[PDB]
């Protein structure tokens, strides 16, 4: 099956899933010269305060935080976006090293890490609909880069010890997802996919230029993972992003200049 591996690869994918190749597809390389800054689009509006979380789970692939979703307890609203999408997870993409594990690009910088914020359209009623439509998803991008600690992300880091394999999973709940936004929600935008098969191209993304810093400790902990389940040959989670992917055409467009 797919992965992250020599043999199984992003550059594998395509077999399996013909979309790889497509019109849409995400991560890509925010040129910053080229972004076109448009006094369009209106501020990020970020309702986090009713958040639910639930439950931690090692998927094989990713770590996933999962929200209640059942209500509009956390939604994200403005920007680019017509309507209201719903918080149902957020996940990590890492590096095996601090210069890469980014999945977007800047000026192809590539960041440590990438925090994916995962919201659906709630006019498509549940997530398995939302995926089928171009404006399904809205998908919030920050990018972590290695420096002072974050203290929100503490209870995540202290949690993965007991979700090391795949399959396994934890309650969590009681998580706040605010301690992880940085301090200005200045956003580049464009219309992509996800970055993972099946690769379906419904996704507005919204990748915010601030990054946040998180300490060597935080993401060493990230890296001590596993892709395999329990009793299989070890193999750490590390490098589970995919890389950039031609723009074709496409206009990525600023909030700000
Ligand atoms: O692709 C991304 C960003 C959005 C991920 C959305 C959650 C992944 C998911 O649920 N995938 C899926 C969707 C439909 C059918 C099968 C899997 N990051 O890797
Ligand atoms: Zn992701």
Same mark, same amino acid.
């Given at each position: ?5 020599? &043999?199984?690869?992003?550059? &594998? ?62 939604? #994200? ?37 990438? #925090? ?43 949690? #993965? ?23 200005? #929600? ?72």
């Amino acid at each position: 099956h797919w992965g992250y591996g020599k &043999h199984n690869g992003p550059e &594998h994918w395509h077999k399996d899933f013909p979309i790889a190749k497509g019109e849409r597809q995400s991560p890509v390389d925010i040129d910053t010269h080229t972004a076109k800054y448009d006094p369009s689009l209106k501020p990020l509006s970020v309702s986090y305060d009713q958040a639910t979380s639930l439950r931690i789970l090692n998927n094989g692939h990713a770590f996933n935080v999962e929200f209640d979703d059942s209500q509009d307890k956390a939604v #994200l609203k403005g920007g680019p976006l017509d309507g209201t999408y719903r918080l149902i997870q957020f996940h990590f993409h890492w590096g095996s090293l601090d210069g890469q594990g980014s999945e977007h690009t800047v000026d192809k910088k590539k960041y440590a890490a990438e #925090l994916h914020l995962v919201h659906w359209n709630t006019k498509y009623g549940d997530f398995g609909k939302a995926v089928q439509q171009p404006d399904g998803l809205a998908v919030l991008g920050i990018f972590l880069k290695v420096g002072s600690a974050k203290p929100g992300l503490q209870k995540v880091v202290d949690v #993965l010890d007991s979700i090391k394999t795949k399959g396994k999973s934890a309650d969590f709940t009681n998580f706040d997802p605010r301690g992880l936004l940085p301090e200005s #929600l200045d956003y580049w935008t464009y219309p992509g996919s996800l970055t993972t098969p099946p690769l379906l191209e419904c996704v507005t993304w919204i990748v915010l230029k601030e990054p946040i810093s998180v300490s060597s400790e935080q993401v060493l902990k990230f890296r001590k993972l596993n892709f395999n389940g329990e009793g299989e040959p070890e193999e750490l989670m590390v490098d589970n992003w995919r890389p950039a992917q031609p723009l074709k055409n496409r206009q990525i467009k600023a909030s700000f200049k």
